[PDB]
Write an enzyme that holds these catalytic residues in place. Structure first.
Site, PDB file in Angstrom:
ATOM      1  CB  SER A 135      -1.117  11.550 -21.705  1.00 26.10           C
ATOM      2  OG  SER A 135      -0.977  11.949 -23.058  1.00 26.10           O
ATOM      3  N   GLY A 136       1.829  10.259 -22.474  1.00 26.00           N
ATOM      4  CA  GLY A 136       3.219  10.668 -22.607  1.00 26.00           C
ATOM      5  C   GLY A 136       3.658  10.871 -24.037  1.00 26.00           C
ATOM      6  CG  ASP A 137       6.136  14.344 -24.957  1.00 25.17           C
ATOM      7  OD1 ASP A 137       7.279  14.671 -25.376  1.00 25.17           O
ATOM      8  OD2 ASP A 137       5.783  14.517 -23.775  1.00 25.17           O
ATOM      9  CB  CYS A 141       1.574  13.509 -17.846  1.00 23.28           C
ATOM     10  SG  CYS A 141       1.014  14.847 -18.934  1.00 23.28           S
ATOM     11  N   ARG A 182       0.819  -1.236   0.000  1.00 25.08           N
ATOM     12  CA  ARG A 182       0.000   0.000   0.000  1.00 25.08           C
ATOM     13  C   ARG A 182       0.851   1.284   0.000  1.00 25.08           C
TER      14      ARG A 182
END
Ligand SMILES: [Cl-]
Ligand SMILES: [Cl-]
Lengths: 254, 254
Positions: B164-166, B143, B124
């Site tokens: 989300s990732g570039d 992100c 945990r």
């Protein structure tokens, strides 16, 4: 067959898992993914999964209910601010299971379905069950911590991060539940289901399940069942869905 | 070489990514993992990563600071309730970057280090940056949504879920940062670093980076650098660490 991902993960834990204390064998960091195309429903075949439980318990969480008497009276075994509460009323003061929370806390589910409809390409369709200010939750916190929906080429996919999972019972159940949530939401929003992607932190096998798990994993999986959504009346919100709306076809577990 | 996982993910997005709108190519659901053993620090070699930025920006978040003037005056480019705030003061009312929050909100970082010391086997040890009641955050949300620490056989590992990732810029930076957080925390707690496990929801390549990314991915990676933690004085809390405490050895990017 994608069930092999599950079986291989089990083998991996059995052969290379750490011993940590009821004892377990464990590894950290794993992924499995299951296609939900052509009505594929990843209900494990190498050992029967409690399908009725999956369904009723998902519909229960989607109603935001927190009283295991509802479940008991449907053949399925106050719970506190467990999943549905967090999903539908995040940040509300949790009082009792018999209490009302309409308009209290953030309805992350409603927010996610709206985003799917208005902005399907969104990268922010996230739902969290993790609230570190809720000490009650934090004393027995959700194993399935967060999930994200994705719409690509008319297909709804879902990824769920699970902080801890027991391979024997919990993980197969959870694969079913999130797969079913994706199918349910895909139907509700006019989309087709894509994929369920399962990310795991601690993945553990209980010592008393070792012997059974090693017999299980020599069984060749069978093709997954199909799942059809055929509502018996109109369904405009996810809490409206009923057990009977789902026909399970071709489920044949060892 | 584990950088191949990154390059393969890039190739995969280039060849099989969806087109969604500034346009991108994208896939959903990916994993990369990097060993941090023998001082391995996964700073990508196929294109130089802004190491000084990684470090200063991590130490800045660990101080819980939210004022990009601190960073600017250290050669690195009010931000609101971004990571550090969520990490260190989760659920506090966010007012201004120049304001004080000591004793406000949940210090998830302090809580995680304590758990690592008292109950290393815990399942945990989770830190969340995702607060759906914080509308400010929710208009430009993190992100990197959540992370989990794990201690197994005296090794600290970390898994981070990124919504989300570039691939071009953001993802290599983030691999560095969470790897460095694990190393930093491993040192602080007397442990050795284990692994960084990176889970991604939307993984996207920008259209204007396509040409450069496809040149990049024919370069053979070079062995990763090593990173040593050698504090210049005593360090009893993570906010105490300084840029100079870290010696980067053998970094030779194309
Ligand atoms: Cl088990
Ligand atoms: Cl990019």
């Amino acid at each position: 067959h994608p069930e092999h991902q599950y079986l291989d993960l089990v083998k991996h834990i059995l052969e290379n898992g750490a011993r940590r204390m009821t004892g377990t064998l464990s590894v950290f960091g794993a992924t499995m993914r299951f296609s939900l195309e052509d009505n594929t429903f990843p209900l494990l075949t190498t050992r029967r999964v409690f399908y009725r439980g999956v369904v009723e318990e998902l519909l229960f969480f989607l109603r935001g209910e927190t009283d295991s008497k509802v479940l008991e009276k449907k053949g399925v075994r106050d719970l506190g601010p467990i999943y549905g509460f967090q999903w539908r009323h995040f940040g509300a003061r949790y009082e009792t299971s018999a209490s009302s929370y309409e308009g209290k806390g953030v309805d992350q589910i409603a927010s996610a379905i709206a985003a799917i409809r208005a902005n399907p390409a969104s990268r922010r369709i996230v739902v969290s069950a993790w609230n570190p200010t809720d000490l009650g939750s934090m004393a027995l916190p959700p194993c399935h911590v967060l999930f994200q929906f994705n719409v690509t080429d008319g297909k709804l996919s879902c990824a769920m991060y699970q902080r801890s999972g027991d391979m024997g019972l919990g993980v197969p159940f959870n694969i079913a539940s999130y797969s079913l949530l994706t199918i349910l939401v895909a139907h509700l929003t006019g989309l087709q289901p894509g994929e369920f992607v399962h990310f795991l932190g601690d993945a553990h096998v209980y010592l008393d399940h070792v012997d059974s798990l090693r017999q299980q994993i020599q069984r060749p999986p069978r093709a997954f069942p199909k799942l059809f959504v055929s509502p018996k009346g109109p369904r405009t919100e996810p809490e409206h869905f009923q057990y009977e709306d789902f026909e399970l076809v071709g489920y044949d577990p060892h």
